[PDB]
């Protein structure tokens, strides 16, 4: 639910890094579970235990990405004494991309995910700061 | 949201009509002929007020009129009436048709002792008029005030200033 997004965002930025890491890990795990559900539905895994293994793989990768991201971003914000700064989210996203690359064991995936995830996270931080709306309400 | 007001159990007391449905059905036609006035007053009250709490006195007059009617019947011929309603009561549908001799005797009895004429087919179902002193209720639905409408369209229609004004179009 977006109650998970609120349990992530109700914690201040450079505070309680363990709690924020836990919240981001929960978000990542939910994402990985949904991904593995659709993957199992559209491409059957030929046996029950291979489906369980694919689920565990996807979910663990996603939760690890979330954990590394939340941990790195919260810690960087509190060390730099710089909340309200997209550089912390960039650092966290690039660390999460490196995590994904080490997981798939691919240097290209690692670098590409570092870059794109970091830029996306920095953009999300800028949108939180400026009030950008993804699903805008019908104002007029 | 407010307390519901209810009559006390004292104001709900009345001399009941404690005869069964066969007796009522055997008497129904003459009873509708004789006690028409208070019954119609009560039904008009009931359907204009839409509140049972506002028509208790009319209901008590209904009870007393029924009791007077049945007292007259008891005083002038209980035996033909008893014959008639026993015949009616035997039937599981309480059909008027299987008891025409008893009904004829009861009808002659009331016509000669009291001058009661049985209403003809189609008369008790007429919509009739009632004269009453009860003032016509003003807001029986207890409605709130209606919200005000939107103002209205008014004026002459002039062409839109500078046309459509879509990005670069001049018309």
């Amino acid at each position: 639910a977006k109650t998970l997004l609120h349990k992530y965002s109700d914690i201040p930025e450079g505070t309680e890094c363990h709690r924020k890491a836990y919240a981001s890990t929960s978000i990542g795990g939910a994402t990985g579970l949904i991904v593995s559900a659709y993957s199992i539905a559209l491409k059957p895994p030929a046996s029950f235990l291979e489906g369980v293994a694919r689920t565990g793989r996807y979910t663990f990768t996603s939760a690890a990405i979330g954990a590394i991201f939340g941990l790195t971003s919260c810690i960087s914000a509190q060390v730099r004494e710089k909340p309200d700064d997209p550089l912390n989210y960039f650092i966290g996203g690039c660390a999460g991309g490196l995590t994904l690359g080490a997981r798939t064991r691919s240097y290209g995936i690692g670098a590409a995910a570092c870059a794109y995830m970091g830029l996306t996270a920095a953009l999300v931080k800028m949108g939180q700061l400026e009030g950008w709306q993804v699903f805008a309400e019908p104002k007029v | 949201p407010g307390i519901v007001e209810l009559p006390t159990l004292e104001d709900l007391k009345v001399q009941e009509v404690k005869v069964s449905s066969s007796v009522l059905k055997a008497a129904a036609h003459h009873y509708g002929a004789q006690c028409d006035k208070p019954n119609k007053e009560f039904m008009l009250c009931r359907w204009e007020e839409k509140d049972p709490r506002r028509c208790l006195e009319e209901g008590k007059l209904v009870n007393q009129c029924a009791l007077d009617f049945f007292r007259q019947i008891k005083r002038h011929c209980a035996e033909p009436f008893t014959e008639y309603w026993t015949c009616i009561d035997y039937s599981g549908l309480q059909l008027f048709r299987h008891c025409r001799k008893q009904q004829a005797k009861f009808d002659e009895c009331v016509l000669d002792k009291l001058g009661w004429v049985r209403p003809d087919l189609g008369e008790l179902s007429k919509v009739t008029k009632v004269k009453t002193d009860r003032p016509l209720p003003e807001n029986p639905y207890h409605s709130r005030a209606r919200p005000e409408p939107n103002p209205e369209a008014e004026g002459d229609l002039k062409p839109a200033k500078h046309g459509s004004r879509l990005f670069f179009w001049t018309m």
């Binding site: - | 209205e152 002459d156 046309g163 018309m171």
Partner: protein
């Protein structure tokens, strides 16, 4: 999401209310009408080209009917469009007039008293 569908006193399927007749009709040389006629002419030419007939010469009655149909429909299209824009402006002005506390007239300053920020280019 549906701004003008619910407007009061609107007939379901008119395409041209009677109030629209208080508006000036589009001139017959309206450039939008000329463009509609040009669309009809292009339809006639493509018609000739698809059926492997001479493109500019083959059916002159047919091309005339193409042009005439496009111009005829475009006239009424333009009438309805101009009428709808007139409705929009009418409603907007009436609403601004009836809600003055939402569209206030504040005193405007000359540039001599507004302090603007200067940014040197160097």
């Amino acid at each position: 999401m549906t701004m003008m569908s619910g407007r009061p006193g609107r007939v379901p399927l008119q395409f041209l209310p009677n109030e629209a007749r208080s508006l000036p009709p589009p001139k017959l040389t309206d450039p939008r009408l000329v463009y509609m006629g040009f669309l009809g002419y292009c339809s006639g030419l493509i018609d000739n080209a698809i059926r492997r007939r001479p493109v500019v010469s083959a059916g002159l009655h047919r091309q005339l009917l193409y042009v005439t149909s496009f111009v005829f429909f475009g006239y009424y299209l333009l009438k309805r469009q101009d009428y709808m824009y007139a409705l929009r402006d009418h409603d907007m002005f009436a609403y601004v007039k009836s809600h003055p506390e939402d569209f206030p007239e504040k005193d405007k300053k000359t540039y001599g008293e507004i302090l603007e920020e200067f940014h040197p280019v160097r």
